[PDB]
Amino acid sequence: AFARDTEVYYENDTVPHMESIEEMYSKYASMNGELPFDNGYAVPLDNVFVYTLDIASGEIKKTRASYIYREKVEKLIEIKLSSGYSLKVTPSHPVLLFRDGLQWVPAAEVKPGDVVVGVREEVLRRRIISKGELEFHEVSSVRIIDYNNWVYDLVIPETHNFIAPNGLVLHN
Numbered sequence: 001a002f003a004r005d006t007e008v009y010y011e012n013d014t015v016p017h018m019e020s021i022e023e024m025y026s027k028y029a030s031m032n033g034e035l036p037f038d039n040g041y042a043v044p045l046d047n048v049f050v051y052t053l054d055i056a057s058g059e060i061k062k063t064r065a066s067y068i069y070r071e072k073v074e075k076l077i078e079i080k081l082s083s084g085y086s087l088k089v090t091p092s093h094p095v096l097l098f099r100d101g102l103q104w105v106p107a108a109e110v111k112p113g114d115v116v117v118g119v120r121e122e123v124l125r126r127r128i129i130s131k132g133e134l135e136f137h138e139v140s141s142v143r144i145i146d147y148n149n150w151v152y153d154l155v156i157p158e159t160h161n162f163i164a165p166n167g168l169v170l171h172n
Contacts, residue, residue, distance in 0.1 A: 001070075001071075001073070001089065001090045001093060001151035001152060001153045002021050002088070002089055002093070002151060002152050002153070002170075003021075003076055003088035003089065003147065003149075003151060003152075004020060004021060004022035004149060004150055004151070004152065005020045005021075005022065005088070006020060006021045006087070006088065006089075006152070006164075007019065007020055007021075007164060007165050007166070008020070008021050008024055008050070008154070008162075008164065008165070009050070009051065009124055009163065009164060009165040010024065010048050010049060010050050010065065011048070011049045011050075011062065012046075012047055012048050012049070013047060016124075018165045021068065021152040021154070022070075022150065022152065024068065025043055025068045025070060025152055028043040028044065028045055028048075028068065029043045031046075032044045032045070032046065037069065038071070039071050039072075040069055040070055040071030040072075041069070041070055041071070042067045042068065042069040042070075043067065043068050043069075044066070044067055045064075045065055045066055045067060045068065047064070048064065048065050049062040049063060049064055049065065050062070050063065050065050050154070050156065050162040050163070051063075051124060051129060051162060051163040052156070052158075052159040052161055052162050052163065053119060053132055053161055053163060053169050055096070055102060055117075055161070055169065058131055058132050058133075058134070059130070059131060059132075060119070060123065060129055060130060060131065060132045060163065062129075063156060063157075063158050063159050063162075064156070064157065064158070065154050065155065065156045065162070065172075066155045066156070066157055067154075067155040068152055068153065068154055068155070069152070069153045069155065070150045070151065070152045070153075071150070071151065072148075072149065072150060072151075073090060073147060073149070073150075073151045074146075074147060074148055075091075075144050075145065075146065075147055076088050076089060076090060076091070076144070076145050076147045076151065077089060077090070077091050077093075077107040077108060077110075077142060077143070077144060077145070078141070078142070078143055078144075078145045079095065079107060079110055079116070079139055079141075079142050080139070080140050080141040080142070080143075081116060081137040081138065081139060081140060082137065082138045082139075082140045083137050085137070085166055085168070087107075087116070087168065087170075088145060088147070089107045089151075090107070090151055091106065091107050091108040092106045092107065092108065093106065093107045093171065094106055094107075094171040095107050095110050095116060095171070096116065096117040096161065096169045096170075096171065097110065097114050097115060097116055097117065098115050098117055098136060099114070102117065104171060107142075110139060110142050111139065111142060112139050112140055112141055112142060113138065113139065114138070114139040115136040115137060115138050115139065116136070116137050116139060116168060117134060117135075117136060117137075117168075117169050118134070118135050118136070118137060118163075118164070118166065118167040118168040118169055119132035119133060119134060119135060119163060119167040119169065120132070120133045120134075120135050120167055121165065121166050121167035123167070124163065124165065124167070132163075132167075135167065137168075153172070154172050155172070156172040159172065160172060
């Protein structure tokens with residue numbers, strides 16, 4: 001799951017939005033209502049789409065996202081890239097790395113010097129979005145953060161990943 005300030009890129013109705021996952025949760029809770037589930041809460045999404053990468057081919061396509069779920073968590077791992085971007089996730093959250101080949105590795109196994117996989121972000125702003133160009137980012141720091149707040153998961157029925165506004169390929 002993702003920290004509240006994780007930016008997400010999505011379309012609804014045909015127009016793009018870029019906002020934090022908490023902002024997006026709050027928008028759809030205003031529009032659709034919140035459902036208590038497990039120790040958390042879920043909100044339904046209507047005609048929200050995110051972009052996803054077929055990692056083997058490099059084809060990017062739109063796919064629907066159905067729900068966002070949130071729950072409270074005490075500690076997260078922050079993976080700070082040399083670029084300055086931070087991915088703040090729960091410790092078992094899979095992160096797409098290149099080590100000996102492309103591999104999903106849980107966040108708690110990521111180390112400084114690892115490289116995280118993304119696409120050139122310009123691809124999300126093209127009129128037609130078809131093929132991604134991969135780009136790798138080096139991990140500078142990995143540390144535990146005292147978080148004590150809501151973490152967010154996106155339910156995407158057809159796929160295991162979606163693309164962030166900075167192009168990172170994130171596990172759903």
